[PDB]
Amino acid sequence: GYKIRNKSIFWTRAGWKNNWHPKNFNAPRPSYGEFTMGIRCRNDHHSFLRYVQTYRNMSRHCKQYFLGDKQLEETFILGLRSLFLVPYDSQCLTDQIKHGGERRFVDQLDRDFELISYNTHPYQLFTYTVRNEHLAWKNEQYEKIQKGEKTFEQELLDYLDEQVLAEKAKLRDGQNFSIERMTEIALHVFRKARAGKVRPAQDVRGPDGNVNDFLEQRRPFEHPNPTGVTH
């Protein structure tokens, strides 16, 4: 499609794609004991245990609002690890960061836990909303199954299993029913099914170049005055 043509896009005064130690005038310099009288520094060796305790708090304090949903605790755990594994798998050389990446990430995670302690972190509210939308749809299926009714998801699975038999019942010259053929069969059913639904217009342009919005009503004028409510 389109590729960046500038070859020096990732060049910095410190090197190629360097986002760990940008070049600045006041560079780090060593210190010598025999000549150093006093010093004021905030660095320490407490980041490792703070990284551990921070994980335990963020996990235990977010589980307060999961209501024992085991599937949510396990899903949340996978998401929590993805947030702590950033320095271990990033392109950025987190071990060569200017003034200690360990202290930097720990202090950044602490600000997240502060919000978690108040139950105000966007990931928390995002989790509650996403889960409630999921359980409402799973309860709709449960209520339809208890009534002996068939779910919209089973009607497709059954409608797709028969369409495969019809295709392989005529595919006798060859006998390799690839996953590609199986896929385009389902998509042909999804497009037809999705189009059947009365959904809001998502694509800007329909079959014609014209936009599918309520504002794309141009001339000629053929609509009369609007009518009032009926009694």
Binding site: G1, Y2, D173, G174, R205, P207, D208, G209
Partner: protein
């Protein structure tokens, strides 16, 4: 034999877009030294169909220029590559021009071919003298009815499997799935049987093409992206009065929007008087449409193509002086004044005509 010379080769699937070579027919001119013309045929359309137009004594186009009827990548005999980026497809032509020792050429196209021709002038303008586009415009045609049919037909062609399908099964498939007579005939003649009659296949890459069209995004051939830029040189557009591809109402503005030197209707943009007929896209079939295109084509090549922008016609070469911008030359002791811009030989790089004439000039003095 002699006038008709089409280099012969086999398509090669290429993983790198730069190792792509173009193949097509070459029509030699009547006269010894003439500039070259590169013409792109409609997508999935045969180059041979344009031979009677460029080889008609009544039109006498070869009297003006040598013609290279060239196939873009994934079309005809040229190499195959899934990408259809006009920047990549334009570099292919530049390598062809290099391998054939062509310094600069006149570019032409029909329909989507017109887009390909204009892209080369947009990406390589210093080496293109002019562009002559026929029933095309630098425009997004994804939602044009004419394009949808072509986009629709190509998708239907993916259902046929030559290995299992018999010759009769194919003919029945085309008539029912392809309603347009011309498209149908074009696709039939594009079917070829490889050596040893192993199996029949299309000369064009049906898979790579359908993905470009079916996806229907910026890289689609119907689309014209802003990335392609502006064409700085001479451009002439000719299309039927009633054309499904270029509508006179609004589809002329892209020409002004994309081509900087386009003056407007009646000077660089013309419409051919005709009736409403879906076959008018193929002007070479109808004498009335072709006779006007040829006259307009011969006029563009003779008087307008390869002429400096600020000059009206080729007649002004050597008698009209262009104003100069101050502080535009390295020489400091230069009295700025009007000048006639330099027009060079069409293949001055791969010949020594300048070195030769310099010697002859010395003999005079």
């Amino acid at each position: 034999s002699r006038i008709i010379n089409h280099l012969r080769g086999d398509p090669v699937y290429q993983d790198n877009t730069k190792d792509v070579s173009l193949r097509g027919t070459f029509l030699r001119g009547k006269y010894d030294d003439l500039p070259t013309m590169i013409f792109f045929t409609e997508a999935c359309d045969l180059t041979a169909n344009w031979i009677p137009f460029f080889t008609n004594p009544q039109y006498d186009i070869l009297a003006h220029r040598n013609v290279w009827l060239l196939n873009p990548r994934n079309f005809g005999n040229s190499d195959r590559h899934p990408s259809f980026d006009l920047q990549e497809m334009s570099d292919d032509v530049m390598r062809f021009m290099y391998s054939q020792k062509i310094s600069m050429a006149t570019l032409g196209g029909h329909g989507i071919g017109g887009k390909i021709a204009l892209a080369v002038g947009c990406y390589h303008a210093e080496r293109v003298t002019g562009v002559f586009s026929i029933d095309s415009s630098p425009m997004d045609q994804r939602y044009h009815e004419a394009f949808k049919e072509f986009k629709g037909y190509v998708n239907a062609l993916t259902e046929i499997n030559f290995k299992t399908w018999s010759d009769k099964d194919v003919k029945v498939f085309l008539k029912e799935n392809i309603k347009d007579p011309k498209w149908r005939s074009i696709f039939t003649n594009n079917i070829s049987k490889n050596a040893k009659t192993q199996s029949d296949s299309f000369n064009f890459e049906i898979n790579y093409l359908n993905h470009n069209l079916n996806f229907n995004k910026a890289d689609s051939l119907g689309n014209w992206a802003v990335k392609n830029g502006i064409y700085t040189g001479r451009a002439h557009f000719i299309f039927p009065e009633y054309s499904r591809w270029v509508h006179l109402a609004t589809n002329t503005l892209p020409m002004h929007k994309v081509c900087a030197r386009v003056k407007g209707f009646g000077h660089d943009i013309f419409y051919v008087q005709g009736d409403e007929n879906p076959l008018n896209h193929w002007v070479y079939d109808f004498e009335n449409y072709a006779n006007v295109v040829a006259s307009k084509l011969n006029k563009f090549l003779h008087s307008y193509d390869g002429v400096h922008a600020l000059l009206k016609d080729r007649t002004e070469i050597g008698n009209f002086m262009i104003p100069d911008r101050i502080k535009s030359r390295n020489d400091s002791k230069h009295i700025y004044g009007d000048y006639s811009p330099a027009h060079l030989h069409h293949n001055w790089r791969f010949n020594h005509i300048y070195e030769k004439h310099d010697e002859l000039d010395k003999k005079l003095n």
